[PDB]
Amino acid sequence: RKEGRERIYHVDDTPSGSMDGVLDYSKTIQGTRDPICAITASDKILIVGRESGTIQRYSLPNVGLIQKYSLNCRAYQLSLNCNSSRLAIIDISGVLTFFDLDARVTDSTGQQVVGELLKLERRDVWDMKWAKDNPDLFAMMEKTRMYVFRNLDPEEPIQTSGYICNFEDLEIKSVLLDEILKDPEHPNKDYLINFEIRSLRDSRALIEKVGIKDASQFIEDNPHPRLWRLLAEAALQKLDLYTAEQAFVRCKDYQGIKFVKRLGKLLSESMKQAEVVGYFGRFEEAERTYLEMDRRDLAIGLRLKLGDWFRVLQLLKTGSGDADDSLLEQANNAIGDYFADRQKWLNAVQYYVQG
């Protein structure tokens, strides 16, 4: 229901969580000595940073004040791991720190402290991203370098200018906004770049060096659902249907299991190539493979499945055989429908009168 979906709270208030109340916009102009300077939320908590270095923890989906923490810094930025227990805080001075919201510190003054400032520190941090899937993978820019972390331990730095765009499935997407905004009306594919974190590059390196057979031992030693797919697509491309089946089983891909079972019934290696080339989305190469095989019928069959009815009709017009009348009818009528569904009636007539 719509009614409880909006609320408003003053930063010096102590709300319980319980009330689906009306918007008291009159409370919003009560003056505060320590204003807000950053906020963040995780689908589980809302974290609010004051200019005093007080940080407030609130619940979600309902907002109640859980705890007030205090720190030796103002926050320039705040971000939370998906499990919502580690807060990555960037100070006003451009220094990184992690704060474990549920945890214990021993402090060198001779003390025990709760709300734990972890030992981590780094400098000139300004862009950061906790991984969407994993609770301890994290990424963090310094200058033209990205220092990916696992827990508090940094990997090898990656050379990069662009902003941290997305982080999931052992990949970090990066975007070159500084190039895009020089000519924003003509952006190019290259202005977004994909990075692979070290566990994925090591596994891609093993598959190239140690080979598809024994590279699987490292993934059985240290498994991840992204790595089973990599071994599967590698094994398919080298036609290892046995290792491809196992790799699809290890990541529970029943579409992949059915596909290796289908390939394993085919008689012709050329046809297994044409079919497996299709799996990755290389449809133009699969079509050329079928034309080279003298399977113009499988070339049209692939185009029917993909819906390229202009190509279906182009092959039927350009081929050596007498094109099936009901298939030219089907082809024209689907092109007529393509334009009519796009409200281009004058184009649809050109095909429907033939079809």
Partner 1 sequence: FQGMFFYLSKKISIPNNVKLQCVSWNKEQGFIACGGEDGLLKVLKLETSNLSMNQTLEGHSGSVQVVTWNEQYQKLTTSDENGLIIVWMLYKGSWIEEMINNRNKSVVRSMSWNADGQKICIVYEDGAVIVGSVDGNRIWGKDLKGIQLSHVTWSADSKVLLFGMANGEIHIYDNQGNFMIKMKLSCLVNVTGAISIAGIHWYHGTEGYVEPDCPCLAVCFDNGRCQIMRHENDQNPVLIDTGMYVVGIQWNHMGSVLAVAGFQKAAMQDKDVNIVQFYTPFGEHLGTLKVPGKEISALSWEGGGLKIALAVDSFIYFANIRPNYKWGYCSNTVVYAYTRPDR
Partner 2 sequence: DMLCFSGGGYLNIKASTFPVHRQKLQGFVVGYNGSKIFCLHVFSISAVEVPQSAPMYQYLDRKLFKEAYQIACLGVTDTDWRELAMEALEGLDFETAKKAFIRVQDLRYLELISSIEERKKRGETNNDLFLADVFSYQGKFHEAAKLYKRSGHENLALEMYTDLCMFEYAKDFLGSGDPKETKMLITKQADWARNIKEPKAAVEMYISAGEHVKAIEICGDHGWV
- Which of 31, 110, 184, 281 is close enough to bind partner 2 by CB under 8 A? 281
- Of 191-220, which residues contact partner 2 (CB under 8 A)? 216, 220
Of 105, 180, 249, 271, which one interacts with partner 2 (CB under 8 A)? 249
Secondary structure of the chain as H, E, C letters: CCHHHCCCCCCCCCCECCCCCCCCHHHHHCCCCCCEEEEEECCCEEEEEECCCEEEEEECCCCEEEEEEECCCCEEEEEECCCCCEEEEEECCCEEEEEEEEEEEEECCCEEEEEEECCCCEECCCCEEECCCCCCEEEEECCCEECCEECCEECCCEECCCEEEEEECCEEEEECHHHHCCCCCCCCHHHEEEEECHHHHHHHHHHHHCHHHHHHHHHHHCCCHHHHHHHHHHHHHCCCHHHHHHHHHHCCCHHHHHHHHHHCCCCCHHHHHHHHHHHCCCHHHHHHHHHHCCCHHHHHHHHHHHCCHHHHHHHHHHCCCCCCHHHHHHHHHHHHHHHHHCCCHHHHHHHHCCC
Candidates 73, 82, 180, 304: give the one binding partner 1 (CB under 8 A): 180
Q: Which of 18, 33, 159, 254 binds partner 2 (CB under 8 A)?
A: 254
Partner whose footprint covers residue 173, from partner 1, partner 2, none (CB < 5 to 8 Å by kind): partner 1
Q: With contacts defined by CB under 8 A, how many residues of the chain interact with partner 1?
A: 21
Of 108 and 255, nearer to partner 2 (C-beta) is: 255
Q: How far apart are CA 341 and CA 9, in angstroms?
A: 49
In the complex, the smallest distance separating the C-beta of residue 312 from partner 2, rounded to whole angstroms, is 12
**Residue 149 Cβ vs partner 1, minimum distance, rounded to whole Å:** 19
Query: By CB under 8 A, is residue 124 in contact with partner 1?
Result: yes
Q: Is 25 in the site for partner 2 (CB under 8 A)?
A: no
Joined together, the tokens standing for residue 191 give: 């202005």
Among 94, 135, 157, 319, binds partner 1 (CB under 8 A): 94
Among 17, 342, 344, 345, binds partner 2 (CB under 8 A): 342
Nearer to partner 2, 104 or 252 (CB): 252
Least Å distance, CB 37 to partner 1, is 7
Closest CA to 220 of 211, 210, 209, 231: 231
When asked if residue 178 is in the footprint of partner 1 (CB under 8 A), the reply is: yes
The smaller minimum CB distance to partner 1, of residues 176 and 274, is found at 176
Binding site partner of 166, from partner 1, partner 2, none, Cβ cut-off 5-8 A by kind: partner 1
Residue 23 and residue 40 in contact, taking contact as beta carbons nearer than 8 Å = no
**Binder among 192, 293, 327, 328 for partner 1 (CB under 8 A):** 192
Residue 44 or 345 having the CB closest to partner 2? 345
Binding residues for partner 2, per CB under 8 A? 216, 220, 242, 245-246, 249-250, 252, 254-255, 257-258, 261, 264-265, 278-279, 281, 283, 305-307, 341-343
Residues that bind partner 1 (CB under 8 A): 37-38, 76, 92, 94, 124, 126-127, 143, 163, 165-166, 173, 175, 177-178, 180-182, 184, 192
